[PDB]
Amino acid sequence: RYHESVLEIADIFDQADFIQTSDAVRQLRALMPTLSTSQIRHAIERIAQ
């Protein structure tokens, strides 16, 4: 009886001031294609200028 796929949000600290971000930021990252070193450098430059 197989597994599945979920996320934790790091709620198992119950300790405030940490774990500010949530689940959704990972979904956006995985949604992204893939970024190479020179592509990231280009992307930083474009948003800056």
């Binding site: 009886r1 979920v6 996320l7 774990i19 990252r29």
Partner: protein
């Protein structure tokens, strides 16, 4: 003897501290997203039963 007024130096550095904070913003942002963070991607195996 000439005493330099404190106005020309206090505001001088105040604007330099502004450029750095506004220049380092993009790469601290786009870098942040591709890190995920505050997640784990786990899996749960059912010990039979229900």
């Amino acid at each position: 003897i000439v005493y330099p007024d404190p106005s020309t130096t206090l505001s001088q550095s105040l604007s330099v501290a502004q450029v750095l904070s506004k220049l380092t913003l993009p790469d601290a942002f786009i870098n942040m997203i591709l890190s995920g963070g505050d997640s784990v991607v786990m899996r749960t195996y059912q010990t039979e039963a229900d």
